[PDB]
């Protein structure tokens, strides 16, 4: 029975993590920095806190944008290779299965405090066939030095190959209407990682390797996602993102979710949210590939009675996702304030909880780790909170 096999183990085994998010993802003027973006810097005690909490997995972003000398080495100044290997070890202290990845360098919209630095350029990749080789090199020069880092680190550790790769629309734009042109490169791009990856040697030759599909959307997952071929089987688990409904988890624009909720985006709840997790559960988990959400989370709220809906949100989709043998890491970019992009919960440098962030982590992590049978998607409902409007 392929949902029963040892890679969808290895997934569930990441639980419910957290991301060091707004860290090594931090970027400006070409160039990333830790404390770039106002998290200062990331400690042994930060991820002795999230052991502590219960989170089981942690994903460490990098952005290598700044810190890549010329074609055609692309040597990584080492320096920064030192302060990832360094925590990727702290995490490892703590007992945590890791994930690390090339993140901001792809970012695809315009929205960017790096513009013109972004090498990682799909709509420049579609446009000849040139410029996919040289970025296609340069992914796998970077992914050759940072498996040779790691080559005698193991399974604890994973890599994921691309973070979120888009064309500026969020898979609203060209990409519905070029021909697949789009996917085929991403696909194409994630295959030279794989390839990269386990030509580092050691221990990579049978890590476990997060891949994406367009901009992390599952739909556009199930749909284009082609995985690589390997070199080893049962070693790929498909990496989605999830804030949905934006606006409702991102924005805040609405402040209540669920079928109790009046101030919702309008038709899209649970039944959404779980159909969502069942085509992941359909295509990849039943067939033996692990899934896990690289990012999750829903932002912060003002009122006492709009956070209450936040826990519910939590509550119900975590344990939708342990159901389906789903792991999942929240969004964390140390930001306290409530409403749009507040979604810190725990401080970068201490480990200790932000503000009310402890209800949210126990409410995340409790309700996926929860083995009594009585608990259920049901019963959760059933307790959803009263609207305040
Ligand atoms: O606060 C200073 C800087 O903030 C930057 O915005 C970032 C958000 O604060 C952060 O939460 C968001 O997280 C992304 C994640 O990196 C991505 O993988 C996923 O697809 O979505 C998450 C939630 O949106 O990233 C943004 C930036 O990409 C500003 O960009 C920066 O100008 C500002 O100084």
């Known amino acids: 029975r392929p949902m ?17 998010g707004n860290q090594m993802d931090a970027h400006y003027d070409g160039c990333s920095y830790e404390t770039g973006w106002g998290n200062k810097a990331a400690t042994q005690q930060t991820f002795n806190g999230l052991a502590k909490a219960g989170f089981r997995s942690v994903r460490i972003p990098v952005t290598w944008m700044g810190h ?72 796998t020069m970077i992914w050759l030095q940072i498996g040779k880092r790691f080559a005698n680190d193991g399974e604890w550790l994973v890599f994921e190959t691309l973070n979120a790769i888009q ?48 901009v992390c959307n599952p739909d556009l997952t199930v749909e284009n996602l082609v995985l690589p071929e390997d070199v080893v089987p049962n070693r790929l688990m498909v990496a989605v993102h999830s804030y949905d409904p934006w606006d409702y988890a991102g924005s805040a624009k609405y402040n209540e979710w669920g079928h109790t909720g009046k101030d919702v985006v309008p038709g899209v709840g649970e039944e959404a949210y779980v159909g969502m997790l069942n085509r992941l559960f359909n295509m990849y988990i039943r067939r033996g590939v692990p899934v896990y959400f690289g990012e999750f989370g829903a932002v912060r709220r003002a009122s006492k009675a709009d956070e209450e809906f936040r826990l519910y949100y939590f509550r119900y989709i975590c344990k939708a996702m342990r159901d389906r043998r789903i792991s999942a890491l929240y969004w964390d970019n140390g930001n306290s304030k409530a409403g749009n992009d507040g979604f810190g919960v725990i401080d970068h440098a201490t480990g200790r909880f932000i503000g009310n962030g402890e209800q949210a982590v126990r409410a995340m992590i409790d309700s996926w780790e929860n083995n009594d049978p009585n608990y259920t998607l049901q019963s959760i409902y059933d307790s959803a909170p009263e609207s305040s409007r």
């Not at 029963?4 to 060091?20: C, P, R, T, Y």
């Not at 000849?128 to 992914?139: G, M, T, V, W």
Request: proline share 3%; net charge negative.
């Open 4 to 20: 029963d096999n040892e890679a969808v183990q290895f997934g569930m085994s990441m639980g419910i993590g957290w991301n060091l």
């Open 68 to 139: 890549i000398g010329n074609a055609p080495t692309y040597a990584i100044e080492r320096g920064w290779l030192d302060r990832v290997d360094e925590l990727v070890h702290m995490a490892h202290k703590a007992g945590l299965i890791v994930i690390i990845n090339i993140h901001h360098d792809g970012f695809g919209a315009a929205d960017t405090p790096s513009k013109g630095s972004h090498w990682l350029d799909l709509p420049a990749a579609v446009a000849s066939e040139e410029r996919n080789q040289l970025i296609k090199q340069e992914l």
């Open 167 to 214: 064309d500026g629309d969020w898979g609203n734009g060209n990409n519905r209407r070029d021909g697949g042109a789009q996917y085929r490169v991403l696909n194409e791009w994630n295959q030279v990682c794989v390839d990269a990856i386990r030509a580092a040697g050691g221990k990579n030759e049978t890590r476990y390797i997060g891949v994406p599909g367009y």
